[PDB]
């Protein structure tokens, strides 16, 4: 909407709005990044966020973006990992044959680099950690 309050005046209106009986909503999407910064001592930030789309008239699609996969079983405790699910599909880094193809798409009509230098740069980054940002730099 457009109303701005605070962490308590607003946090109380969002709790009573998701449980409103007799009001249609839309299939929204929630995209959050870096979950370790939202961790508090009472664990009342990640636990209540996952219980919102588990209601009747709730169309929230949470896209929890983080780093490693063992976070729910390390930093977060039992209540956060319970009401979540085991639907954690990790993404593996690019292979050696994939780094030479992504760089080829960017240089489709750029006649300025030999074929012996393209595979050499994509070889050192593939052995370090396979980061997609450490190859084009």
């Amino acid at each position: 909407t457009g109303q701005k309050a605070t962490a308590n005046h607003a946090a109380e209106l969002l709790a009573k709005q998701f449980c409103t009986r007799g009001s249609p909503q839309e299939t929204t999407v929630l995209l959050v990044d870096e979950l370790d910064l939202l961790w508090t001592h009472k664990q009342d930030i990640m636990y209540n966020l996952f219980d919102w789309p588990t209601h009747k008239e709730a169309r929230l699609v949470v896209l929890a973006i983080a780093n490693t996969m063992d976070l729910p079983e390390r930093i977060m405790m039992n209540r956060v990992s319970s009401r979540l699910g085991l639907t954690r599909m990790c993404f593996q880094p690019y292979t050696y044959s994939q780094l030479q193809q992504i760089l080829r798409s960017r240089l489709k009509h750029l006649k300025a680099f030999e074929d012996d230098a393209i595979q050499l740069v994509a070889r050192k980054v593939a052995a370090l950690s396979g980061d997609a940002r450490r190859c084009l730099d």
Binding site: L120, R123, K124
Partner: protein, 119 residues
Amino acid sequence: TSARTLLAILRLSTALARLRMVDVVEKEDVNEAIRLMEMSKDSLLGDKGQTARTQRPADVIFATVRELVSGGRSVRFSEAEQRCVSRGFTPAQFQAALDEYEELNVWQVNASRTRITFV
């Protein structure tokens, strides 16, 4: 092991040379003399000292390339084979050994596989 065991080795050299009615010593009297010493020192413990080594068909191939990396960088592919065929290495196994390390990002070749340079 000090100077006390140094004179004990030369003492066992005459224990076997006098059994063949000869006045000279051969290599048999030396290997059999140290055989009883290695068996006695292993009996003082609770196990036997052995070794473990797997004959990899590509372990000595990488060591031969090391002789050209310390001398230069642009090593010719045809020049590196002047030392591999000296001992008796088959060239058929060398073609299958390059992909074992190039896949794991060690070196790199060209399209004709005629240029090799250590990265």
